[PDB]
Amino acid sequence: ETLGEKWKARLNQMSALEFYSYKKSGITEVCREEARRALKDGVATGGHAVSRGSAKLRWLVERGYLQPYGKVIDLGCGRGGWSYYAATIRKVQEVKGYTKGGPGHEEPVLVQSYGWNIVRLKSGVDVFHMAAEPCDTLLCDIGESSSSPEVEEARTLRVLSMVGDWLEKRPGAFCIKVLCPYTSTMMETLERLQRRYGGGLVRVPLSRNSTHEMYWVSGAKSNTIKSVSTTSQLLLGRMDGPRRPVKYEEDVNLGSGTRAVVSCAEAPNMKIIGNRIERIRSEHAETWFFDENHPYRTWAYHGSYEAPTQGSASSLINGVVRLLSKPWDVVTGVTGIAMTDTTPYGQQRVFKEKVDTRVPDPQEGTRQVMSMVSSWLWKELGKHKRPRVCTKEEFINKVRSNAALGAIFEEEKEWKTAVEAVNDPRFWALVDKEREHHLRGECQSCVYNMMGKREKKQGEFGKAKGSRAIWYMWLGARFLEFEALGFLNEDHWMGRENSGGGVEGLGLQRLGYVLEEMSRIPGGRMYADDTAGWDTRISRFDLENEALITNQMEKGHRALALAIIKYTYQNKVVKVLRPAEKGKTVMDIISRQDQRGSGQVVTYALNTFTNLVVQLIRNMEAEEVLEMQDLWLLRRSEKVTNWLQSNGWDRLKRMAVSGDDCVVKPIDDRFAHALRFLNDMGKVRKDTQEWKPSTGWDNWEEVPFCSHHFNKLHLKDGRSIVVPCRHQDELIGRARVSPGAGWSIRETACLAKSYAQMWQLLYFHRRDLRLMANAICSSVPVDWVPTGRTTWSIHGKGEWMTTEDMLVVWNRVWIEENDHMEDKTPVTKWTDIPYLGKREDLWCGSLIGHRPRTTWAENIKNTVNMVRRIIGDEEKYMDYLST
Ligand SMILES: Nc1ncnc2c1ncn2[C@@H]1O[C@H](CSCC[C@H](N)C(=O)O)[C@@H](O)[C@H]1O
Ligand SMILES: [Zn+2]
Ligand SMILES: [Zn+2]
């Protein structure tokens, strides 16, 4: 009927050679060879266009049909070349990109093109079910070419029926793909929408001649039929006669590096940290400079200089575990697990979103409630115990050789390992120097080093996930910390003994008993909700409440303590890695006055403390003691301590608090919706709607705490034991990974054994974990020593790191030292110990009953013998498998 529809009919009529002739005939294209090589490798610093679309947006804006600015939203970012070109534009200030990804379709690619620091991308989003947000510039490249116009219409109509919802929130500029603009209903609807919102339709000559695709843009204005018939006419004419010459152009070069951004950070207290700053400058005045392109909004930028790049993302596999776990090759939750990206790139692309936040400054009423609760808790904790100056002797008592230097200055660059330094009086001479400066009120050396952590974590986009930041200080400063405050860890101030709610020291064996005991106490449901990125949410006021313990010290101890707190905690100076433009890599120095780092000596202590403060506050709001205006200012202060000294311990012993994570059993269900003080402090609940009621639980076995939910089991004779559990796939994945680069197969086998005896010790109740662990200890020589680290949890002491037999260690930890089990009879054989319930083992990730696990289970000894052969025969193996 129409000039377009006939062209489509003809296009379908054709054959393959005519297809080829027409498709490329006489359009413009870009030199994409450079780019496709850079994509083959993934050279982020090249600064090349990740897709074709970057040119399409370039043409649209440089010709002047689009006026992009401010907050930009890319719908269907795909690779993200639209977003990546957006980043470059002078007036843009934030780029959000949404797409689907998953099986078959494109996932977002990550590069270091100019302004990448404002690019937040996400996948797994069927934007139809996503709500609208107020963008300044709206982009949508969502089309889906097909043969029949029947579908082109329907799909473009679905697209528009979606994007209207967004458009009615008045974007300053917009560009949306319109696949099918050539039919009756389409011309109609496009005319109506052009009337009701403006804009105009433009055809890009870069696009292939095989579709009628057009773009709907803000800056232009034109009648629909007129442009549609221009495109239809030219498309038709191009068909017959000569195959007209293609036009070559060069692809846009995006540049590289970061972009200048809103600097809304708090100004620094120059005389606390100035000594450290100007020391660093005096050291590196060779190449010292101030980069104008900084991606940091909340940190005070103090300068940068050239440095060498650190870490990598490469991830090695432990063939022992893998070849023993062939049937798990299909599950994504296992194969997708890999290393964390600890390059400056991978550090920063987590930093800029997770770490670069500034918390809502809580109101004076919540401020006063926090200081009150913290004062009461400092009183009640320091009743039995009292502080003390910790000694050099105890420091070297604790120390072992595998800790980190923190090599910052020249004077500290002598040693290589800890046990070497600790026995050299030069070290302690410098410690005494920094101490006698601290007592005078000047900080010279206590400076933070920072890099991303090496973790085994889920892969995102089918790629290495970004590394969360870890920052710690040089060892001497850690000694100052320890002598001042380390007594909190040493004397077990957070132990359940003294505290009641804390569990400082208790291993993963015992904690379930705490959960059951808590469950026997009557009340409402059990409520465990994880706080979103705890460390970054800590405010000045929380730190100043944690400094109140100094009330109970003596004057020397308080002098050193407050010195270290103020010049260290409440004013922090950091050295961080950033990747510069065109390859080179640099070090930046920044400061701030809130949050806490995971490399502080009393991280666990302080976190558990203020977390207890928060849980107390939430129980006060839940049980209606805190009224709704007391956020603003405190009415009847007294009635806080009236409650605390009536029920404070009574509620406290209904808590299990471990640093970041928490578990509570309140009196009634109102705790589920007493979120307002919780929100005011800035301690939001992770990835749940900020104001929605909390998901509680009834049966205590299904409570997750420190990534584990605990289950009770009766022995085959009669006694009862409590064991920790989690999802199998996580542990099999963790085992698969090899932390070290360039490691001989020996130490990878050592790791494999470490994991094996970890499973035997802890997750024996899992059929596949016991099976595979016995297979590992069998196929691995029982000679060799277990080395490496398994799961970073502090509640794993390291009890499986010895060639001792695991039956005896099992008896020791689960019976002989088992304080919650009276009957001391050590059971003599493995297969007496029961597995978990079949339905629950299936639920937590087991593959029992399925044919891969059957086939692999029957051929276990063939594979194990193959492992022995590949390692090297005539080494002392042992066949643990009996059954
Ligand atoms: N409704 C939807 N929401 C998000 N992504 C979608 C989608 N429908 C398709 N996609 C995926 O997202 C991509 C959109 S096209 C990619 C173009 C990209 N914006 C660029 O700058 O070059 C497609 O490859 C498709 O696989
Ligand atoms: Zn200092
Ligand atoms: Zn379980």
Cited resolution, angstroms: 5.0
Specify the ligand 1 atom closest to the Cα of 139. 19
Would you list the DSSP string of 536-592?
A: GG--HHHHHHHGGGGGGS-HHHHHHHHHHIIIIISSEEEEEEEE-GGG-EEEEEEEE
Q: Which two tokens stand for residue 506?
A: 């208790």
Ligand 1 center to 106 CA (angstroms): 7
Ligand 2 center to 479 CA (angstroms): 11
CB 141 within 8 A of CB 84: no
Specify the ligand 1 atom closest to the Cα of 162. 1
Which of 670, 567, 548, 566 lies closest to 606, judged by CA?
Answer: 548
Q: Which ligand is nearest to the CA of 78?
A: 1
Which of 33, 34, 49, 116 lies closest to 253, judged by CA?
Answer: 49
608 belongs to an annotated ligand binding site: no
For 417, the 3-state DSSP assignment is coil
Specify the ligand 1 atom closest to the Cα of 83. 21
Q: How far is CA 440 from CA 275, 299, 391, 485, in A?
A: 13, 28, 21, 19
CA distance 543 to 27: 64
Which of 422, 442, 427 lies closest to 568, judged by CA?
Answer: 442
Q: Which two tokens stand for residue 553?
A: 């010290």
168 belongs to an annotated ligand binding site: no
- Element holding 737 (H helix, E strand): strand 737-738
Please report, to the nearest 10 degrees, the dihedral formed by the alpha carbons of residues 362, 260, 583, 472 taken in order.
Answer: -20
Specify the ligand 1 atom closest to the Cα of 51. 22
Q: Which ligand is nearest to the CA of 725?
A: 3
Would you list the DSSP string of 597-635?
A: -TBSTTHHHHHHHHHHHHHHHHHHHHTT-S-TTTTTS-S
Beta bridge partners of 97: 74, 121
Ligand 1 center to 78 CA (angstroms): 4
Domain ranges of the chain: 1-263, 264-883
Ligand 2 center to 305 CA (angstroms): 23
Specify the ligand 1 atom closest to the Cα of 52. 22
CA distance 304 to 97: 30
Which of 681, 676, 677 lies closest to 691, judged by CA?
Answer: 676
CATH 3.40.50.150 fits 1-263, yes or no: yes
Specify the ligand 1 atom closest to the Cα of 159. 1
785 belongs to an annotated ligand binding site: no
Q: Which ligand is nearest to the CA of 731?
A: 3
Ligand 1 center to 156 CA (angstroms): 13
Beta bridge partners of 705: 708
- Per residue, the 3-state secondary structure of 79-108, as one string, reads CCHHHHHHHHCCCEEEEEEECCCCCCCCCC
CB 651 within 8 A of CB 616: yes
99 belongs to an annotated ligand binding site: yes
Mutation test residue for ligand 1: of 60, 109, 142, the one with most atoms within 8 Å of CB: 142
Output DSSP code: residue 117: G
Q: Which two tokens stand for residue 171?
A: 């974007």
- Element holding 421 (H helix, E strand): helix 418-422
Mutation test residue for ligand 1: of 105, 146, 204, the one with most atoms within 8 Å of CB: 105
Which residue type is seen at 786?
Answer: P
100 belongs to an annotated ligand binding site: yes
CA distance 65 to 220: 5
Ligand 3 center to 640 CA (angstroms): 40
673 belongs to an annotated ligand binding site: no
Specify the ligand 1 atom closest to the Cα of 74. 19
443 belongs to an annotated ligand binding site: yes
10 Å CB burial of residue 36 (0-12, 13-18, 19+) is exposed
CB 487 within 8 A of CB 636: no
With left for phi above 0 and alpha for psi between -120 and 50, is residue 624 left, alpha or beta? left
Q: How many CB atoms lie within 10 A of CB 391?
A: 12
Mutation test residue for ligand 1: of 99, 125, 128, 166, the one with most atoms within 8 Å of CB: 99
Q: How far is CA 616 from CA 598, 630, 670, in A?
A: 24, 16, 14
Scored b (16 or more CB within 10 A) or e, 843-857 reads: ebbbbeeeeebeebb
Give the CA diameter of the chain: 98
Which experimental method was this entry solved with? X-ray
Ligand 2 center to 717 CA (angstroms): 60
CA distance 659 to 607: 5
Ligand 3 center to 765 CA (angstroms): 9
CA distance 83 to 547: 45
Q: Which ligand is nearest to the CA of 279?
A: 2
CA distance 284 to 307: 10
709 belongs to an annotated ligand binding site: yes
- Element holding 870 (H helix, E strand): helix 860-871
Would you list the DSSP string of 468-521?
A: PEEEEE-HHHHHHHHHHHTHHHHTTTTSTTTTSSB-TT--TTTHHHHHHHHHHS
Q: Which ligand is nearest to the CA of 560?
A: 2
Ligand 1 center to 107 CA (angstroms): 9
438 belongs to an annotated ligand binding site: yes
Within its chain, how far is the Cα of 420 from the centroid?
Answer: 35
Specify the ligand 1 atom closest to the Cα of 141. 19
First to last CA, the chain: 77
Q: How many CB atoms lie within 10 A of CB 719?
A: 16
Q: How many CB atoms lie within 10 A of CB 426?
A: 12
- Per residue, the 3-state secondary structure of 642-710, as one string, reads HHHHHHHHHHHCCEEEECCEEEECCCCHHHHHCCHHHHHHCCCECCCCCCCCCCCECCHHHCEECCEEE
Specify the ligand 1 atom closest to the Cα of 128. 1
Please list all protein residues whose beta carbon sits less than 5 angstroms from ligand 2, which is an ion: 443, 446
For 438, the 3-state DSSP assignment is helix
Ligand 2 center to 405 CA (angstroms): 16
Mutation test residue for ligand 1: of 100, 162, 175, 215, the one with most atoms within 8 Å of CB: 100
CA distance 799 to 816: 14
CA distance 706 to 658: 8
Handedness of CA 79, 85, 88, 94 (dihedral sign): negative
Output DSSP code: residue 535: G
For 51, the 3-state DSSP assignment is coil
Specify the ligand 1 atom closest to the Cα of 82. 21
Output DSSP code: residue 741: T
Which of 105, 66, 104 lies closest to 85, judged by CA?
Answer: 66
CB 14 within 8 A of CB 22: yes
- Element holding 320 (H helix, E strand): helix 319-324
CA distance 489 to 659: 12
CA distance 437 to 442: 5
Q: Which ligand is nearest to the CA of 162?
A: 1
- Per residue, the 3-state secondary structure of 796-843, as one string, reads CCCCCCCCCCHHHHHHHHHHHCCCCCCCCCCCCCHHHCCCCCHHHHHH
Which of 860, 859, 846, 858 lies closest to 776, judged by CA?
Answer: 860
820 belongs to an annotated ligand binding site: no
Ligand 3 center to 842 CA (angstroms): 9
Which of 696, 883, 680, 662 lies closest to 775, judged by CA?
Answer: 883
Q: Which ligand is nearest to the CA of 127?
A: 1
Q: Which residues approach ligand 1 with their CB closer than 6 A?
A: 51, 53, 76-82, 98-100, 105-106, 125-127, 141-142
212 belongs to an annotated ligand binding site: no
Ligand 2 center to 273 CA (angstroms): 9
